[PDB]
Structures are given as C-alpha cells and as structure tokens.
Design a protein around this ligand. Sequence first.
Ligand SMILES: COc1cccc2[nH]c3c(=O)[nH]cnc3c12
Ligand SMILES: [Mg+2]
Ligand SMILES: [Zn+2]
Length: 313
Amino acid sequence: GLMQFTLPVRLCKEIELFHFDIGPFENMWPGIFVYMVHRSCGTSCFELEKLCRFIMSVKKNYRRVPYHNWKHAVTVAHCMYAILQNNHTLFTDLERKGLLIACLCHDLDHRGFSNSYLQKFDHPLAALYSTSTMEQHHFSQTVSILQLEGHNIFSTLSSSEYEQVLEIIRKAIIATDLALYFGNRKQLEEMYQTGSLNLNNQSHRDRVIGLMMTACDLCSVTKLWPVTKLTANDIYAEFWAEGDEMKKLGIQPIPMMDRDKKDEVPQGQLGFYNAVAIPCYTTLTQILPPTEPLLKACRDNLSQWEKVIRGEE
Ligand SMILES: COc1cccc2[nH]c3c(=O)[nH]cnc3c12
Ligand SMILES: [Mg+2]
Ligand SMILES: [Zn+2]
C-alpha cells in the first residue's frame, strides 16, 4: 500500500497535459500506466502484483504493427487519464477503474487491418461477429486475460460491481468502432442542443463515455505538430499495407490506402479533421468544457495540414 510510483520531474509535470507524449522508452510505459491508475483511482483500486501481471499479459498480446501497438494502447489510456483528471467529480470510482483498463485493452491483438478488410478477406472473425468485428475480438481478448490465474485485478469487487465494470469496459471498447461514432455524436449534438442531455440517465452516460473513447482513440491529432506528423507516418504505414492486401484480393483500394497516391495524403487528412476529428472534440468540449485543449490542438494541427498542402512545408 505504501509503494507509490513516481516519474522524473519533466514527466511528472508534462503527464498532466493532454498533449503529453509517452516517449521512446518501452520499459517506462507500464510505470506511466500504473502512475496514472494510482492518481486517477487510488493506490487501493488494484492489488499491484495483479495489476503488473495484467499489464504485462496485455503488452504481450499487442502485436508489432506500425500504429495499432502497445504504444497506442498506453497513449490512448493517457488521454483518458487527462480527461478524467480535468473532470474529477463527474465519474464514479468504478468508471475511472473501468475506462483506463478499457483504453489499455481497446486494440488487443490488432493485426493492422480494418473491419472492412476482414469482411473482404472472409476472415473467421467476420463470421463470428458481423459488426464491430475487431472491437468484439478486443473485448473477448480482455475477458480472456482477466480469466488468467492471478490476473483478475477486479477480484475484490462485489458480484454486481464486477458485472457493471465489464459492461462499462464492453461498451467502451465497442465504441472505438468509428462506424458507430457518427450516429453517437449526432445524437449527443441533438441532446445537448435541445437541452435534454442528462448525466444521471445511464443510456446518456454510455453515449458520452463512447465519445470520450473516440476522443482518446484519435488523440494523435491533438499532439504538438512534430508528434502528430510522425504518428501519421505510422498510421499511413498500416493503411498502405492494407491497400496492398486489397490489391491481392483483386480490389483497387480507396486512394487514401494506396501507396502509389501518397500525394493525396494531405487532402486525405483535411477531410479526416473536417469530417471526424473537429466535430468529435467540438461535441466533446460542449459536454465536457475542461477538454477544450484537445479541440484547440486539433485546430492547430488542422492548420498545419493546410500549410502542408499550400506547399509551406
Ligand atoms: C485512425 O484514425 C486516425 C488518426 C489520425 C490520423 C488519421 N487519418 C485518417 C484517415 O485518413 N482515415 C481514417 N482514420 C484516420 C486517422
Ligand atoms: Mg481499434
Ligand atoms: Zn485504437
């Protein structure tokens, strides 16, 4: 109980900021995650032997892919940390526990291919779950790791609290399916704007947690330009492999995913910021005002992409 984790002074200060980068040192990421659970949750929330054994099984089960890797998991968990810390009293003891584990686990066993590629490939997972294919797999992998002897970090919860936390985690993970984000944000837009948004309404909470998950998942667009720019190389490395694999299935990929049409990337990112990112953190900022820095950074990076197209870098 008396064992805290601490960070070097630069990290200790930077980590509180939305635009924090977790750095190139893999071996320091679990300590960053544990630091965040303790500060976000309590030193009491989890038994450290169990949490450390969970984290290391979770790491082992992320693959060595260009973007959808262990570093993405820990980056997405840090954004959820930032949101929860700037919105202290809005979330339950349980929700804070659940949402940081859901973020760490949200892309478990990702191979770097869209749901769409699974369906055109006719992958067994597409027969097992017809929509949110990878997302239903990620949640399945989370429950598998939780069921490993010595890895049940929720052991000390009541029977009912346990079922609530796995339902928070199941909804959280499913909501990282971007095909579901469009409808979800539109319904949140209308509810906030007609003024019927009610945080005591569970069905409403779920919608708002889902937006947060999208917000955390896309948080590469909210970093300082040098980090956003270099992450975009990792993101596009996956898109180009997928487009190659579409070509092997006798299907010309959308020009975004095609590694012959790299010229089209900057306009690809405009559309993505204009149709996805800005709307996402706009709505997020209207429901949770203390998340405004994410909107501001996303606008800054949209501006940086405009400058790329205008041949100014
Ligand atoms: C995965 O989300 C992202 C995070 C950052 C930059 C991104 N660009 C695109 C894109 O062009 N299409 C779909 N997703 C993205 C994306
Ligand atoms: Mg995902
Ligand atoms: Zn993700």
